[model samples]
Target: MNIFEMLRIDEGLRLKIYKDTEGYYTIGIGHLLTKSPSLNAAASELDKAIGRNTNGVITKDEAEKLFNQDVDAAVRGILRNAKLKPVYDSLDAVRRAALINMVFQMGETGVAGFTNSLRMLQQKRWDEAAVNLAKSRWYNQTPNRAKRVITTFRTGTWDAYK
Candidate 1:
């Protein structure tokens, strides 16, 4: 499969957040309703922040707008907080896609939470990053995905993910 499809499968990727299977507010991929203001907002500011033209009766078109905007911002956040843009650009598209998936799934703040793994990656310590990536709560939360991302760095692509 393609890198995009792998990312979509692994991250629960979607064209729009829509109402999740659990029937809660969402905008991109998925997240707890209370965790994201733009998803469950009652005010204009928060609603506008995510591309919702209005706070009432959101349309699929509106949701799709937010998905595109939000994912772009998340990718930028990864570029910003993970030290610098070049650092992220240094990796292959698959590994980069893995990071974007992580950031999209967790937000910039969530991706930043993986201190050891991010540090190892920045330090150019592939072995350490792979080890650190496997030793986290996220790894426990999704072993197959964790393995896929960790192995991406080791091999410089998504082949290990398969």
Candidate 2:
């Protein structure tokens, strides 16, 4: 199934996903309606950031005018730019969905920053990947959210509490 299907997101949430005045499309999270543009954006701007700390390929101007910046677009951008298509092409649907979710939440640079963790996954070191997943600063910053996604990745089951 697709990442959106797995997340069971609705259209309202999709519309709520928007680029702030700063030129980054942010996702609203939790009770605060907190805005996080993407990991790549976050890393360059904040303390508890994930992904790569580099300027995103798409400028603020481009994203500001776009209609949709949901999970699907985020994942496609990551795979296309990172040259991860071949690796993505070889993954099972669930694995692909989970990784996309990770990228959606984390951003291409943030997710890419998980080099050792990803390398472990590439080598089929499931246990190591799981451990490395929890070791990052992102994991510590959003423990519950991270746990939820990691659980989905490791077990393929959704947990509501997360």
Candidate 3:
């Protein structure tokens, strides 16, 4: 399938801002914030307002462009920051993509927010890793998403939910 199809399996298609796994002002398929300079530029680079005062928001089309560019960057970041490259390299592409997805979603921190989840994942305890992933505030906050993500670990499928 298309490259973005992998992202769609995890993030779906979001056109509006919504809280992410860690509740950091997010939008457009787990993009963490509106901090892109080109995105939130002057009125010269914005949707002229009718409400909300400034109307500084990127359109879906722009978000798609950013998503494509950002995913490529995040993939490189994940590879660069991986302390144990062999562990990552041994994974199937879907799992490898999940690692990159996690990096993109939670910063290049590499499961920094999850405890047992990381250990279980590294140790290849797929079922327990899935369980550990679900046993957190993140899981409680986004149960539906958790299923898709956790199942990605368990079954290593990109299209778990979507």
Q: Give the winner by TM-score.
A: 3
Give the distance in Å from residue 126's predicted Cα in candidate 1 to where it truly belongs: 2.3
Candidate 3 clash pair list: none
Candidate 2 at 161: error in angstroms?
Answer: 8.6
- Best by the lDDT measure: 3
Off by over 4 Å in 1: 1-3, 13-28, 31-33, 36-64, 82-86, 160-162
lDDT of 3: 0.63
Residue lDDT tens for model 2, 86-155: 5466556666776776766656777877777777666656666778899888788767667766665566
Question: Tens digit of lDDT per residue, candidate 1, span 7-121?
Answer: 5566463433355433545544443234333554533433554555554444555544555665677777876774535557777666677677777656677676776677677
User: Each model's TM-score, in the order given?
Assistant: 0.64, 0.57, 0.68
Pairing residues by index, what is the TM-score of model 2?
Answer: 0.57
lDDT of 3 at 72: 90
- Better model by TM-score, 1 or 2? 1
By lDDT, the candidates rank as: 3, 1, 2
Candidate 3's displacement at residue 36, Å, is 13
> Per-model C-alpha lDDT, please?
0.62, 0.54, 0.63
TM-score of 1: 0.64
